[PDB]
C-alpha cells in the first residue's frame, strides 16, 4: 500500500497473539512495544531518542504480522509512549520511502 | 528517489545556506534541528520522544531544502540527538511510505 504522511502512519500489528496499534517509524533503528509478555530469552538494553534513554528488554527471533505481512526479528519491550515498528522489521515487509 | 531502510534514511538538507545531515523520520510529527541561528521570532514548544519531553524553539515559515526539494515550513530548534525531518516537511516534498 501507499501510505501518505498527512497523519501518523499507524497500522494494526499482531504480536504474541495480541492485536496492537503501531507507528511505522523510519527514524527508529529497532522495534519497541509497550509492556507485554514475549516467549524465549531476553537481555537488557538502553535505547535513546528525543528526551533521552529508556531501558527495554530485547527479545530476538520474534514473529510479527504487519498489514498481513509476516516478519521475524528483534523486538524491544519497555516504557515506550507509542508502539513503534522500526527499520529492522520495516525492511522485511519491503517498506521504502518514496518521493 | 526510492529510499530503502537497511540503513538510516539520512539525507543532506540546506538551511540558512548551510549543508547539514538529517534523518527522514516518519515517526516525528515535526522537524527538529540541533542548535543554530534562524531569522525571526520563535515561540515555545514541548515535544515528546522516547526518553521523554524536551523544550524547543519554534520558527515558522523557514526556507529549507531537503535532498534538492524545496520546502517552507516550521522548524523546531533544540537538544535533539540528530536532525530530523518530520511529517510536516515530508508531506511538502511529497514523501510517502510504500510496501
Ligand atoms: C534517535 C531518533 C532519530 S530521535 C527521534 N526518533 C524517532 O524515532 C522519532 O520518530 C520519535 C518516535 C516517537 C513517537 C512518539 C512518541 C515517542 C517517540 N519521535 C520523536 O522523537 C518526537 O516526535 C514528535 C514531534 Cl517532533 C512532535 C510532536 C509529537 C511527536 Cl511524537 C529517533 C529515535 O528515537 N530512535 C530510537 C528508537 C526509537 C524506537 C525504537 C528503537 C529506537 C532506537 C533509536 O534509534
Ligand atoms: Cl534529548
Ligand atoms: Cl532484527
Ligand atoms: Cl529491498
Ligand atoms: Cl510546517
Please explain how this structure is put together.
Two copies of one chain form a homodimer. By secondary structure, the first copy, chain A, is mostly beta strands. Chain A has one domain: Acid Proteases (Cathepsin D, subunit A, domain 1), CATH 2.40.70.10. Helices cover 4% and strands 56% of the residues of chain A. Chain A contains one helix and nine strands; from the N terminus they run ββββββββαβ. The first copy, chain A, has one helix at 87-90; strands at 2-3, 10-15, 18-24, 31-33, 42-49, 52-66, 69-77, 84-85, 96-98. In chain A, strands 2, 3, 4, 5, 6, 7 and 8 form a seven-stranded mixed sheet that branches. Chain A is globular. Chain A starts with a strand and ends with a strand. The A-B interface holds A 1-6, 8-9, 23-29, 32, 47-54, 67, 69, 80-82, 84, 87, 90-91, 93-99 and B 1-6, 8-9, 23-29, 32, 47-54, 67, 69, 80-81, 84, 87, 90-91, 93-99. Strand 9 (96-98) of chain A pairs antiparallel with strand 1 (2-3) of chain B, so a sheet runs across the interface. One chloride ion (CL) binds next to strand 7 of chain A.
Amino acid at each position: 500500500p501507499q501510505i501518505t504522511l498527512w497523519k501518523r502512519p499507524l497500522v494494526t500489528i499482531k504480536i504474541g497473539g495480541q492485536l496492537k496499534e503501531a507507528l511505522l517509524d523510519t527514524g527508529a533503528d529497532d522495534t519497541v512495544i509497550e509492556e507485554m509478555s514475549l516467549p524465549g530469552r531476553w537481555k537488557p538494553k538502553m535505547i535513546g531518542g528525543i528526551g533521552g534513554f529508556i531501558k527495554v528488554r530485547q527479545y530476538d527471533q520474534i514473529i510479527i504480522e504487519i498489514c498481513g505481512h509476516k516478519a521475524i526479528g528483534t523486538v524491544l519491550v519497555g516504557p515506550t509512549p507509542v508502539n513503534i515498528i522500526g527499520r529492522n522489521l520495516l525492511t522485511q515487509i519491503g517498506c521504502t520511502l518514496n518521493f
